[PDB]
Amino acid sequence: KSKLPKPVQDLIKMIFDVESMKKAMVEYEIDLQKMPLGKLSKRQIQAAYSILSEVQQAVSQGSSDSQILDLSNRFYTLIPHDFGMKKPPLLNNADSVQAKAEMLDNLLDIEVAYSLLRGSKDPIDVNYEKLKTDIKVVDRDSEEAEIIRKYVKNTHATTHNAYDLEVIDIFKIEREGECQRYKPFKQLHNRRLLWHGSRTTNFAGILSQGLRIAPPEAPVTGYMFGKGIYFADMVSKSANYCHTSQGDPIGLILLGEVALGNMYELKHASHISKLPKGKHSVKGLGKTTPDPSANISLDGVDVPLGTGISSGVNDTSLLYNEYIVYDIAQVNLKYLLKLKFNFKT
Ligand SMILES: CNCc1ccc(-c2[nH]c3cc(F)cc4c3c2CCNC4=O)cc1
CATH class of the missing domain: 3.90.228.10 (Phosphoenolpyruvate Carboxykinase; domain 3)
Structure with missing residues (x-):
């Protein structure tokens, strides 16, 4: 039924690909059961950013391992991870803090994509209009x-x-x-x-x-x-x-x-x-x-x-x-x- 050109249909499928979203979250070692796509929230991600800023400040200031461990555990409480057999990586350097900040940036846009997608006509045409x-x-x-x-x-x-x-x-x-x-x-x-x-x-x-x-x-x-x-x-x-x-x-x-x-x-x-x-x-x-x-x-x-x-x-x-x-x-x-x-x- 979709009258959109094939390349545009392929683009819509590519951008609203739920499997790509889940694969990204698995790669980040996010706990998909504790934080499913539909439970991503602006206020929790905002609070997570603030904690990462405190971690960045603690690391460059040369703070104690106790206060770094505390902040690192607070981050993982806000944003549940699943490391399986491996223990949770300590957020005690700038590169690790930046990697988690960039993960949050990507998670926010994944939340937007999933919220649009679940917010007579061909599903491709419906999702096209939501962009x-x-x-x-x-x-x-x-x-x-x-x-x-x-x-x-x-x-x-x-x-x-x-x-x-x-x-x-x-x-x-x-x-x-x-x-x-x-x-x-x-x-x-x-x-x-x-x-x-x-x-x-x-x-x-x-x-x-x-x-x-x-x-x-x-x-x-x-x-x-x-x-x-x-x-x-x-x-x-x-x-x-x-x-x-x-x-x-x-x-x-x-x-x-x-x-x-x-x-x-x-x-x-x-x-x-x-x-x-x-x-x-x-x-x-x-x-x-x-x-x-x-x-x-x-x-x-x-x-x-x-x-x-x-x-x-x-x-x-x-x-x-x-x-x-x-x-x-x-x-x-x-x-x-x-x-x-x-x-x-
Ligand atoms: C979000 N973490 C810090 C950060 C990450 C990425 C970028 C960045 N720098 C760029 C220079 C540039 F010439 C092009 C691009 C970027 C980006 C990401 C945005 N996309 C670009 O093409 C800047 C800051």
Whole structure:
């Protein structure tokens, strides 16, 4: 009965895949009986973030093993885990705290996906409408597809040699309310078409609610430029955040129009609470940048699809550029790509 094109139906099945959600939770060693998908709650996850912030503070402060163990046990009480024969890993380093924070980020979007899914017509059409997003297939033979394929081909980083990328499908997307929300930023200068990678299990949340900023209660660990929305001009830097594997080599990646305006240019980590007055974004400066002479205009937006060349910058923490905005209204999502990851083994 569903009149949606086959590629769009396949996308809906992929994003609302309950088996992918359960597999993710098993990998995280979550107790699926004590915290089923339907029992995930914002208030409990909020409280879990706060505890992880206390753990992060305890670890860097060099607190006693007693107070670290206490906080570690409090986290596992809020978010039940099942380690089987193995005892529960002690949360006593920054990497472990960041891994649990990123698990919570993914769990929240899985909760959104499951709540939508269980919230006459073909089930595929019903679930499509719940995304509150217009999704159209971009024709393979179109100049539009040629530009996007070239962006993918040209901006694969030399140091990301674990996989090759193949574009399966290109979708043009329009989130309900996003045009009205973006309107004020639409006439800002320096609008750029940039990559945003995420786990497939996040995309129901991303399409229904848009790209969002980490809450205050989330720990600061791994936010190089503070709590904002991060984008790449190199497809492979973003593609890495799809967290695809040989077992599941199909990923989803966004092209967003980002209203960057006056960029605060940084070479090193700075946890931005407030931009300098007159700045609209941060650019992390990479050693390698898309060749600016190959910059193209797609529907009034700059597409940096040039091959990676040396920037001017040797004295930087970053191999590749990154772009951060601190207002959700500065992003207009344009395309969603289904990518095949061909791992080299
Ligand atoms: C949430 N834990 C800390 C954290 C995790 C991931 C990111 C991040 N940095 C990026 C740079 C970039 F150029 C592109 C991306 C990211 C991300 C994740 C979002 N997606 C990206 O493509 C930033 C902070």
